[PDB]
From a paper:
Type III CRISPR systems detect foreign RNA and typically generate cyclic oligoadenylate (cOA) second messengers that bind to ancillary proteins with CARF (CRISPR associated Rossman fold) domains. Can2 has two distinct domains, linked by a 15-residue highly flexible loop. At the N-terminus there is a CARF domain (residues 3–151) and at the C-terminus a nuclease domain (residues 166–366).
SthCan2, with selenomethionine incorporated for phasing, was co-crystallised with cA4. Unambiguous electron density in the Fobs – Fcalc map at 3σ at the interface between the CARF domains in the dimer of Can2 corresponded to a molecule of cA4 enclosed in the binding site. The cA4 molecule makes symmetrical interactions with each Can2 monomer, which differs from the asymmetric interactions made between Can1 and cA4. All interactions made between Can2 and cA4 are solely from the CARF domains. Hydrogen bonds form between cA4 and main chain residues of Asp20, His21, and Lys99 and side chain residues of Ser19, Asp20, Thr42, Lys99, Tyr118 and Ser121 in both molecules of the Can2 dimer. The structure of Can2 bound to cA4 represents the active state of the enzyme. There appears to be room in this cleft to accommodate canonical dsDNA if it is assumed that the flexible loop (Thr294–Asn304) can move to accommodate the DNA, allowing nicking by Can2. Clearly ssRNA as a smaller molecule could also be accommodated in this cleft. This analysis suggests that the mechanism of cA4-dependent activation is likely to be via allosteric structural reorganisation that opens the cleft, allowing access to DNA and RNA substrates.
Numbering used by the authors:
A (entry chain B): 11 to 156, 164 to 220, 225 to 298, 302 to 366
B (entry chain A): 3 to 155, 165 to 366
Write the structure that this text describes.
Amino acid sequence: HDTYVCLLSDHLLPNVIPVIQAPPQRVILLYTPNNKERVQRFRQATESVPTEIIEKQVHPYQYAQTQRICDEILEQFPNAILNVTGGTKIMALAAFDRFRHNHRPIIYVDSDSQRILYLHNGESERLGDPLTVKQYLACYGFKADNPKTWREVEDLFAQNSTKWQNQLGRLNWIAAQQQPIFTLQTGELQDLLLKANLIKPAEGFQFTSDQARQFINGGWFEHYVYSLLRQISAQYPIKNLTKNIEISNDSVSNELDVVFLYHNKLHVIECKTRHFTKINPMETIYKIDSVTNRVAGIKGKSMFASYYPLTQAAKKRCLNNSIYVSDQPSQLHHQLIKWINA
Amino acid sequence: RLDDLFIIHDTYVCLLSDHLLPNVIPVIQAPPQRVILLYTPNNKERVQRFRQATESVPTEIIEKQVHPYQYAQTQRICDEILEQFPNAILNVTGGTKIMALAAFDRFRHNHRPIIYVDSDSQRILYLHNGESERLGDPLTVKQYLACYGFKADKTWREVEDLFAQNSTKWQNQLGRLNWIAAQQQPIFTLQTGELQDLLLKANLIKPAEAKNAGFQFTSDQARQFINGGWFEHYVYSLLRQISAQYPIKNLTKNIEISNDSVSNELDVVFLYHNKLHVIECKTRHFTADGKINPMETIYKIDSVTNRVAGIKGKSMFASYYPLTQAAKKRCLNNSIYVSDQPSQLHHQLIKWINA
RNA sequence: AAAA
């Protein structure tokens, strides 16, 4: 754990995981032209860990120049260890060659099997779960900004989602548009919202508060999904479970409905339905695909959870985009367990 | 010279992975006698994409299974390949680093040629001798899409040029007519002026009431043209001009791209330096207040172009209407080139295509 | 093709 040599590239996670697990004295970061901002991401991700960071520039596609930099590093730090997981194959082949020639340890992080491979001796080790959500987001340039009676309604809405589909969808729309006075047919649902004090009659009905409006504006379903994951957390080791995280990189901001870490992979659920004529899921699928790839990277996992049934086309695009889909709140607990395992 | 290497070296060994392009480009350029495809478990569909991409160039194809994360086992398979085909050449661009390190090691030990495809500089690097060669441009749009499992399914030119040149001064009038055309509102008002005279003279609008208190489109094709179609033609016509000096390939408008499960419509696509270029230039999504809302379009561009064109694919968002700072910042964040100033588009297209 |  003396000197750790990392090759920086699009995905910093496999360089950061070993440094958080077992802090070395020194990290040598091999960065490439126009990517010095990756050095700053690496510092931000490892801020919690006292460690000296040395930066060295190499060309992504120059075998000989990478061989020369590794030779220089091994002269100055003979007890160096190489993380060969990052970089181009040119960078990685060059560095492997010089570290092998000097009989040095060489590690590769396999996130599929959650193992560190020791390429020098063929051995391996299970990874821990060292990452927080803060550290994971930092690797992608992102930082975070941010009643008893109503939980009962949330469970009844979830259990009755098929038969109250249209009424709840319509109330979501009304709440989204901030339409101050609205009609609702007499029935179990109107009685329930009146008894729960979510709606009151107009001097027609109105929401009893902005909080009540937010709750009917798909807020109930966001809390339902979060509350299933708190239950599931009791039996599966989900980490850093958070609702309504607001993340920025200084150029864009994204809101994420529910996020957690499991086996060092960020899991993102989209379960706000207030984007979307009705509800328009196609615009939501494109957003999930775009944002989750930028925020959670290639090993990140995305789910689209809905109280309203999705069309065949929407389900086919989700399958095509590797987005797990639940449009049956009755089945969500079982589906969350299936998704998390996988 | 790659044609030369494939006369002396009969057998091309490549490692299959998410991006088949760097294995396919050398095979289309210079067809070898035999290809050995190293595929991994649950990814036999990559063998089928490779066959489909190289259908125009039938060779002998041998398939061999390897584990993505087993160094010693990949070393043994490469040893076996080199025993049976001693004149093998390795394309080390594909695969995991474990696959690639294992194969490199055995091919280096046997003093074999080893190539790596650099799409940034458009070069084949010969890792055995430090030499390199410019790639050609034999790749078609059909072959490119096959690597990602996809298949491809009047008087008014004067008006088009005047709209492009006057986009700043007619911004609001043209935006408003785009909205009307999008909503299919059949009868509309227009202030008297240069623009009304132009549309009347071009026969794009005709009067609908006396005293020109109302107008209508002269046809559905006239409506389509006012529904941002004029700007789509402007963009395509800049690419025809540029084609006269730059080797843009397979320039297409309004392409339908499908796999088994999804279809995507794309405004303008071409190949340049073996990279797929996608332009979004359709104006058809408005709010209730008639403003364009670009954010939903940016997410679609980001999602579709990454699936259809892969990580080296290039996307641009072109508009005649000014975009908000936030929309421009999301485009920058998502590596989408953005133009909201038709006066600058030619220069921006040249910058974009040359990175 | 810069954790495949």
